[PDB]
């Protein structure tokens, strides 16, 4: 069997990986590290008018989540960017120019969702890189599928990665898991090798 | 004994439950998921005037935690709503109409508190449901006691739950654990079955 000291080592290593942003890979799309969205190059935000911000009871304005939130680590239910329908896109200026090796997408767990269903999750998606920061025509880096029956956090490795560098990338959502009104993106990460 | 593979499975399952809001139950009182307080139907906030917000050194206004914070997941010391004395109440519009099956209350751990005491914690409490959203007379769903000697997060199952649905609920604090000035509520959750 295993010894007591061995069990403690296994637990220590597991919690250290947990504390390293769960997956232990640097994220060049993290907003606090220097990444940002290019708002004019994202899908229109799904505006719902169900959340009202006020002062002293007097109405003010509606509350909605902007594309910035896909670059932010809080992923409690509703801390997600929504666009209308099952196709949408977001363009991100990474914090540094890198050779991308993987991306990570996550969604809220089924256990924290009504009826244990996450139909607003992205399904098929594609990642594009823009060699020149201001060019409008991107290069396909990879196509993947977020598995609604998989772990909440899923990492996707570029199958045959072609080592040039990029600082501007696009997350293009092609389908969702069946929600008839919107698609929700909780957090998008980009991993790779710096210069 | 146990095998190495078995230890890894146990740790994996434990961290997955940890990541699912610690308890793996959807929370219909979570603000980001669509819940909100009815401010005119909560206790007056304990206002202390010890926290001053300013700009360039010029005084501005006092900082205090509103009842919204009981619907928010950050539970570091002081990220709690306080009311004066040992009796108080908060009314919450849940994110959906549900059949309530349990509630969860948590407090800061003794280890993070001076003298390892949490006398501001709620003690005896009761949960009421308001069948019609605008009615002022509630139905008792259950009476429980938060155990200051128990785990920081405590879940309470409605002992004989009587399946109608509610969207408006009240947390009524009847006693606290002895603090002579105030009672502090860190986070309140409501669990149940949607329609």
């Amino acid at each position: 069997g295993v010894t007591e000291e061995q069990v403690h080592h296994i637990v220590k290593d597991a919690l250290q990986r947990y504390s390293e942003d769960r997956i232990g890979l640097a994220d060049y799309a993290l907003e606090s590290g220097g990444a940002s969205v290019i708002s004019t190059r994202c899908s229109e935000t799904y505006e719902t008018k169900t959340a009202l911000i006020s002062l002293f009871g007097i109405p003010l304005w509606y509350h909605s989540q902007s594309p910035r939130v896909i670059l932010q680590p809080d992923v409690h239910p509703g801390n997600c960017w929504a666009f209308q329908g099952p196709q949408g896109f977001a363009v991100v200026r990474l914090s540094a120019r890198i050779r991308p090796t993987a991306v990570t997408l996550e969604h809220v767990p089924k256990a924290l969702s009504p009826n244990s269903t996450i139909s607003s999750a992205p399904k098929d998606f594609a990642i594009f890189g823009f060699d020149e920061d201001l060019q409008q025509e991107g290069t396909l880096l990879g196509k993947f599928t977020y598995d609604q029956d998989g772990e909440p956090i899923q990492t996707f490795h570029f199958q045959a990665p072609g080592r040039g560098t990029y600082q501007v990338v696009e997350l293009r959502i092609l389908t969702n898991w069946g929600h008839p009104e919107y698609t929700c993106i909780y957090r998008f990460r980009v991993h790779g090798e710096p210069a | 004994g146990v095998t190495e593979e078995q230890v890894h499975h146990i740790v994996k399952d434990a961290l997955q439950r940890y990541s699912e809001d610690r308890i793996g139950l959807a929370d219909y009182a979570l603000e980001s998921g669509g819940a909100s307080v009815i401010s005119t139907r909560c206790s007056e906030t304990y206002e202390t005037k010890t926290a001053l917000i300013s700009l360039f050194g010029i005084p501005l206004w006092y900082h205090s935690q509103s009842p919204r914070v009981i619907l928010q997941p950050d539970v570091h010391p002081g990220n709690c709503w306080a009311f004066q004395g040992p009796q108080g109440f908060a009314v919450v519009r849940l994110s959906a109409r549900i059949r309530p099956t349990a509630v969860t209350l948590e407090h800061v751990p003794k280890a993070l508190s001076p003298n390892s005491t949490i006398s501001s914690a709620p003690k005896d409490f009761a949960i009421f449901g308001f069948d019609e959203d605008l009615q002022q007379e509630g139905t008792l769903l259950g009476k429980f006691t938060y155990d200051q000697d128990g785990e920081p997060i405590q879940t309470f199952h409605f002992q004989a739950p009587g399946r109608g649905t509610y969207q408006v609920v009240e947390l009524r604090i009847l006693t606290n654990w002895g603090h002579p000035e105030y009672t502090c509520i860190y986070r309140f959750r409501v669990h149940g079955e949607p329609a």
Binding site: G78, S113, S120 | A35, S39, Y62, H63, S66, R93
Partner: peptide
């Protein structure tokens, strides 16, 4: 000056 809080009210579920 006085105390203070933005208030948030939902009349329907936000996207999740």
């Amino acid at each position: 000056a006085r105390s203070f809080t933005l208030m948030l009210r939902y009349n329907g579920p936000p996207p999740t």
